[PDB]
Design a protein around this ligand. Structure first.
Ligand code: ZN
Ligand code: ZN
Ligand code: ZN
Lengths: 67, 49, 436, 49, 116, 269, 48, 46, 49, 245
RNA sequence: AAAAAAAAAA
């Protein structure tokens, strides 16, 4: 539901490169140019961002149990 | 080979021979390696024609 | 149909326009249906038919829900497609978005659900993009120490320690009081040794004053989790009044023996009978280990033979340690070329940065086209890579095929299937061991 | 009149837009809800009449 | 539930000797050294430093099981040189070689940082 | 029968990556150096997690696993800190563990992105890697969110936690891995035929190659031995890559000296 | 369905009631248990 | 002791002795949840 | 078998005995199947189960 | 139904010999072997009942001559821990224990063997790959059973009849039922090729995985300029005795 | 605690 901290195959830190990936994707970039701008030159780190889903945004829409 | 090594040597020697094959072969396979791929499924274009 | 996304040109307008008709299976004997308009544009000298009445919108909709999830199902075997449809319902993932408030007896939630990089256009409408089940993982196809034989797989320990297929199993228990006017009375409170008869040997200190545990308390073994004490029947014997040392009996609900975890959610309400009704959800951590059942999207089921750390297994020239290794000998017998096409398209889409299309019966996707596009990205055109030994560092003599695929974990864990018994209960009739 | 004829890649895009509109309107569980509405509205009135 | 602890791959237990020496009886001047709680790294170093010695005729490591962190080395030499002395000279030469590696790497980092 | 005399040639050096060539050394040296850089190189990572408020949409163990993988700057700290088993302490001495705290309560209508910057440290030097990112005031990249996102919170959710970070290496757990992929390569022209190309024309050339355009494989040399190796060590942000090399060599000193000490102890029998 | 309380509700209205917007429904709730009715094959009646 | 729960839709701290019926005192809602405990339990970050 | 009236599928012609409507597959699994011969492979693969 | 039995999912283990089975630690702690008390091993059974069920290896019960059972779980009295000659101690399953290994459905005689227990940490059954042909196992979620003999004359019957190497040849078609399969057979095919020229270091690596070797290395096929062996020369060391074929 | 039904794995 959230981005992982590290690349599984690789160990590269990917937790800081998801909201920047979204911000690059929304303006005018494609996915490949956004991955190239983030420094993820290996496709092992690129597959962590190409197929990532953010299900915690749907989880945060629900009302919390404690006010 | 397995049948005649059972019949000529005995049960225990053949059973040890079974285990003596596989460890050496699997350790040699680390040096050699074996792999199938999508390139093995594609033949010559002349053969395809 | 490009402005029904704007306002109003719905599908019923398209049906009412006279271009789409509901043809049933009885009317199929009297109509003529084609694959494509390319069949319509054929010249009459070599035309297969000249009187066409209908045309298929897309043939790939002849599949169902769990059979359309296979990337390139036309390159695979039909019994293996049936196997993938059978174990497609046994995949692990986020089953629903409001699972935090739902109360299911058995549930599983993956940490990081992954949408498939190699996907069709059919899972856009099954909401598998929004609710996925499975993980894209780097796999190679080679033989490493013989532990992957007979459909077996070997995971990477460093990836699993980073969070590869680690999941949470939710288990729900429930209990209820009964205050019927003719019945024994039971109440929810913390049991006491001097007041309850036949108390089982458990740790009763974890319960609260109402006999119901608080969430966040770690439970393990045979810890008591719901405290219910039932009033004993009025067997007031006048021959000996000192024999009634207990007025209540323990009717508590206990944790399952071979499960440990943390109490996630605690629920009290009123049932249809108006009595108190408790429902508790306890979460447990399911780390992948040896023997856990994994499967592909092409019917390549198997179990984890062994785990290997990153320093003790194969690595490429780019230092890429794959997440998972499989047996090549499982490939030709199962007849899964679509798995190889999925791997090649996954490597191409991960190097390029695009979501791959795996729609069946599509002439725009070819093996040679994917090979030609993959050749431009500095890799081998058949997707082969040169790796090294993990223990020694020597180059592998045979080049190996590597790339990302989509693998799905299965619910047949070894923790839910291990059983051992020395001596235990016997039946009241035949004095034989139990069942289950 | 030939401008209304759909080309090949336009045919694949148009047919997937048709599939998108069909799944946007009808959905996946349309027959269950439709049979439930048939049972609730017309069938119960037919039983009591 | 049967998961072994993750610190057992490098930590000896109570009363567990690290190096166990067994005298081979098939040939002469041969020994087997068993080292626990390690992996292919140290055995590969010991072996590929021993193989440069012409005085040795047999030097070989083997891990019997990936789940058991333990490996054995069989060493047989000629009849003028102990296998234990051969292994001692091997680890001494390894220490000298990677000390040279450490100082050449330190000099390389110093010249690369000062050169800009 | 004596030791080798190897040589160094560093080609590229930056903050998180180093590229170098080793000359005149064995293949086991390079393979075990890669092994000790990945596995047995120690660093500091969060190990002991205590939660006092977890009213978010995530579980306790998922948040603990997410904060355990966060790299920490431990270049000058890991060589002095001892292990927990090697201390006479019991209640987490400052020479044994590093204390971190976090307490974020969201009271705004927008989403609060709790990142590593909210993880305060008792030690003045043991910090996350985002201290290198907060000093970039020339941010023409367009986005200032260069920090590792720990969790997102809505209004009414709070998170309070106390953590102790200990010393460990990647063989024990992958959260103590200091590198982010070590590239190792020998003989890029296949002069030794250690690997067998059925079609050498279909394979792209390596970056360390020495052949021209129309030549695809070097001529076979049976007398050739592995003595030239290319290494590209990329850091994950926890440690500097030359410091990763230095502590890997020091771990190799400790292991070989321990083997020598054990041999000298068992020799008197 | 048409007569249920979740008829033609938005995603925000379903989320405020702690319901999944992606949930298609199609099931009954009997004593808190989700029950699904399987369609049964049969012969076509009034057919020769 | 007379301890507390959270109402399903009020999200309100309702306190009672554990013999009262399960009912919110502000809106009358049969659904209540138990508060997370104050006991601190150690979690490993592996 | 002719499941329909002298047709295996409605996409063919009545009284057709050619290998496209018969069930012969002229393409490999690497090249991909047409939907009719994929359905015929489903016919073949159901019988083994 | 039987009492002393277990069942779990099987996983491959190539380095194990065929007459061995890998047993999980919790199964070996739960299942007990009822060993008699002898003067030959009085001290070992004494230290086993002193360790008890809390530590592995240990014991769970002492059954004495008159049928009285003494437990270890509920803090046993030290006066009850007396081991006279001829008593019964239900010890834990240690190494080299003969057990029955059976996969269901059992279609023939060869689908249940006798095996020697080797204790491995993980919670699956571990055995040799050549067991896959008589058991018809596929390692795709196969649940499979193990049984422990509770009398040592039955253990002698397991050793003399039910063991795997005594059941190599089927009487059904006078053929072996286990064989070299999968990538082991593929590398046997790829290793006996004439062009496979293998160095001193690689055959040196392959040497220690032959425990029946007589520590007499062969003279190489190639002596100058580089000492090289071949695949048939090193498969020759694997084959014992006088074999002509 | 029994029995019945359903869902599955081999
Ligand atoms: Zn990576
Ligand atoms: Zn300390
Ligand atoms: Zn309320």
């Amino acid at each position: 539901m959230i981005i992982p901290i590290r690349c599984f195959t690789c160990g590269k830190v990917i937790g800081n490169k998801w909201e920047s990936y979204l911000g690059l994707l929304q303006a005018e970039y494609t996915e490949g140019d956004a991955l190239d701008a983030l420094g993820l030159k290996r496709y092992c780190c690129r597959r962590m961002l190409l197929g990532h889903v953010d299900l915690i945004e749907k989880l945060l829409n629900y009302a919390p149990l404690e006010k | 080979l397995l049948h005649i090594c059972f019949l000529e040597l005995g049960h225990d020697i053949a059973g040890r021979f079974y285990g003596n094959i596989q460890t050496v072969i699997n350790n040699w396979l680390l040096f050699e390696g074996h792999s199938i791929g999508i390139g093995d499924t594609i033949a010559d274009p002349q053969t395809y024609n | 149909l490009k402005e029904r996304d704007y306002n109003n040109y719905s599908w019923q307008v398209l049906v009412a326009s006279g271009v789409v008709e509901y043809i049933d299976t009885l009317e199929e004997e009297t109509v003529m249906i084609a694959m494509s308009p390319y069949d319509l544009k054929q010249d009459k000298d070599y035309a297969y038919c000249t009187t066409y009445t209908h045309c298929e919108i897309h043939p790939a909709m002849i599949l169902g829900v769990c059979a359309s999830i296979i990337p390139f199902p036309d390159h695979n075997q039909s019994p293996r497609n049936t196997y993938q449809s059978a174990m497609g319902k046994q995949a692990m993932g986020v089953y629903i978005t409001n699972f935090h408030v739902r109360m299911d007896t058995l549930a599983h939630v993956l940490y990081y659900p992954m949408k498939p990089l190699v996907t069709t256009r059919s899972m856009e409408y099954l909401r598998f993009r929004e609710l996925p089940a499975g993980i894209n993982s780097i796999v190679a196809i080679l033989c490493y120490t013989g532990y992957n034989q007979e459909d077996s797989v070997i995971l990477n320990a460093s990836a699993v320690e980073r969070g590869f297929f680690r999941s949470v199993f939710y288990r729900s228990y429930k209990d209820s009081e009964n205050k019927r006017v003719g019945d024994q009375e039971e109440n929810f409170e913390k049991p006491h040794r001097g007041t309850c008869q036949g108390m089982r040997n458990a740790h009763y200190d974890k319960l609260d004053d109402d006999g119901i545990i608080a969430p966040g308390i770690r439970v393990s073994g045979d810890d008591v989790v719901i405290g219910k004490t039932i009033t004993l029947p009025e067997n007031d014997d006048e021959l000996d009044s000192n024999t009634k040392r207990f007025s209540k009996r323990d009717a508590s609900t206990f944790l399952r023996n071979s499960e440990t975890g943390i109490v996630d959610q605690v629920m009290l309400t009123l049932n249809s009978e108006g009595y108190k009704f408790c429902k508790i959800r306890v979460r447990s951590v399911r780390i992948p280990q040896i023997g856990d059942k994994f499967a592909s999207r092409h019917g390549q089921k198997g179990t984890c033979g062994i785990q290997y750390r990153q320093e003790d297994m194969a690595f490429t020239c780019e230092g890429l340690a794959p997440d998972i290794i499989i047996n090549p000998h499982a490939i030709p017998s199962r007849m899964t070329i679509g798995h190889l096409i999925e791997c090649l398209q996954g490597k191409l889409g991960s190097n390029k940065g695009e979501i791959g299309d795996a729609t069946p019966f599509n002439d725009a996707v070819n093996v040679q086209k994917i090979s030609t596009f993959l050749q431009e990205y500095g890799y081998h055109l058949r997707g082969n890579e040169v790796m090294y030994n993990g223990h020694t560092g020597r180059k592998i003599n045979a080049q190996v095929f590597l790339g990302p695929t989509y693998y799905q974990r299965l619910k047949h864990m070894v923790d839910d299937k291990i059983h051992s018994r020395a001596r235990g209960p016997v039946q009241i009739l035949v004095r034989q061991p139990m069942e289950g | 009149e030939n401008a209304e004829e759909i080309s090949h890649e336009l045919w694949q895009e148009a047919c997937w837009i048709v599939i998108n509109a069909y799944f946007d309107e009808k959905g996946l569980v349309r027959q269950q809800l439709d049979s439930f509405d048939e049972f609730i509205q017309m069938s119960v009135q037919r039983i009591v009449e | 539930m049967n998961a072994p602890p993750t610190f057992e791959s490098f930590l000896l237990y109570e009363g567990e000797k690290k190096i166990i020496k067994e005298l081979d009886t098939k040939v002469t001047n041969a020994a087997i050294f068993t080292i626990n709680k390690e992996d292919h790294t140290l055995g590969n170093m010991i072996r590929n430093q021993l193989l440069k010695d012409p005085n040795v005729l047999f030097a070989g490591y083997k891990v019997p099981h990936p789940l058991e962190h333990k490996f054995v080395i069989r060493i047989q030499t000629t009849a003028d040189y102990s296998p234990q002395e051969a292994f001692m000279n091997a680890i001494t030469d390894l220490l000298a070689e990677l000390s040279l590696f450490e100082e050449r790497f330190k000099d390389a980092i110093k010249e690369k940082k000062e050169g800009g | 029968p004596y030791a080798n005399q190897p040589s160094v040639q560093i080609t590229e050096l930056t903050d998180d990556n180093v590229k170098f060539v080793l000359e005149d050394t064995e293949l086991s040296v390079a393979n075990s150096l890669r092994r000790v850089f990945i596995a047995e190189t120690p660093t500091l990572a969060i190990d002991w997690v205590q939660l006092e408020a977890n009213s978010t949409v995530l579980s306790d163990e998922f948040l603990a696993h997410r904060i355990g993988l966060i790299p920490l700057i431990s270049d000058d700290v890991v060589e002095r800190l001892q292990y927990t088993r090697d201390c006479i302490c019991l209640d987490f001495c400052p020479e044994c563990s590093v204390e971190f705290t976090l307490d974020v309560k969201c009271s705004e209508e927008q989403t609060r992105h709790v990142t590593t910057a909210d993880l305060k440290s008792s030690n003045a030097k043991v910090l996350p890697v985002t201290s290198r990112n907060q000093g970039e005031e020339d941010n023409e990249y367009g986005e200032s969110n260069d920090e590792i996102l720990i969790i997102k919170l809505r209004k009414g959710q709070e998170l309070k936690l106390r953590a102790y970070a200990k010393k460990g290496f990647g063989k024990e757990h992958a959260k103590w891995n200091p590198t982010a992929g070590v590239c190792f390569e020998y003989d890029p022209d296949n002069s030794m035929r250690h690997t067998l190309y059925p079609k050498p024309d279909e394979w792209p050339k390596s970056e360390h190659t020495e052949l021209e355009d129309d030549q695809y494989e070097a001529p076979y040399n049976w007398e050739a031995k592995p003595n030239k190796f290319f290494f590209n060590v990329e850091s994950a942000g926890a440690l500097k890559p030359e410091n990763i090399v230095v502590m890997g060599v020091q771990v190799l000193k400790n292991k070989l000296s321990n083997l020598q000490t054990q041999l000298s102890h068992e020799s008197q029998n | 369905s048409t007569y249920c309380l979740l008829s033609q509700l938005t995603d925000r209205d379903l989320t405020e009631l702690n319901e999944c917007p992606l949930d298609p429904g199609g099931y009954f709730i009997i004593n808190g248990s989700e029950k699904v009715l399987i369609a049964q094959e049969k012969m076509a009646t009034n057919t020769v | 002791t007379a301890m507390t729960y959270i109402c399903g839709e009020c999200h309100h701290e309702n306190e009672m002795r554990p013999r009262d019926p399960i009912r919110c005192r502000e809106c009358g809602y049969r659904i209540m949840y138990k508060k997370r405990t104050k006991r601190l339990v150690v979690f490993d970050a592996r | 078998p002719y499941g329909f009236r002298k047709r295996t599928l409605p996409h063919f012609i009545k009284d057709d005995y050619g290998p496209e409507s018969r069930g012969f597959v002229e393409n490999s699994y690497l090249a991909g199947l047409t939907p009719s011969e994929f359905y015929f492979h489903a016919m073949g693969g159901r019988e083994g189960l | 139904r039987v009492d002393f039995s277990a069942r779990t999912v099987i996983t491959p283990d190539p380095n194990l010999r065929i007459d061995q089975v890998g047993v999980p630690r919790s199964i070996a702690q739960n299942l007990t072997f009822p060993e008699l008390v002898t003067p030959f091993n009085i001290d070992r059974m004494q230290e086993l009942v002193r360790r008890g069920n809390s530590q592995y290896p240990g014991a769970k019960y002492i059954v004495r001559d008159n049928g009285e059972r003494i437990d270890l779980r509920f803090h046993p009295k030290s006066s009850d821990l007396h081991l006279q000659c001829g008593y019964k101690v239900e010890r834990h399953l240690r190494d080299d224990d003969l057990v029955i290994f059976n996969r269901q459905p059992t279609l023939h005689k060869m689908s249940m063997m006798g095996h020697r227990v080797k204790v491995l940490p993980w919670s699956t059954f571990r055995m040799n790959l050549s067991c896959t042909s008589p058991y018809n196992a596929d390692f795709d979620g196969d649940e499979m059973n193990l049984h422990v003999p509770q009398s040592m004359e039955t253990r002698a019957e397991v050793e003399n009849i039910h063991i795997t190497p005594r059941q190599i040849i089927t009487p059904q078609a006078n053929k072996p039922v286990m064989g070299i399969v999968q990538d082991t057979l593929t590398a046997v095919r790829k290793m006996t090729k004439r062009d496979v020229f293998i160095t001193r270091e690689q055959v040196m690596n392959l040497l220690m995985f032959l425990p029946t070797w007589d520590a007499k290395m062969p003279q190489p096929c190639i002596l100058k300029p580089r000492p090289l062996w071949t695949g048939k020369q090193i498969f020759s060391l694997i084959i014992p005795g006088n074999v002509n074929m």
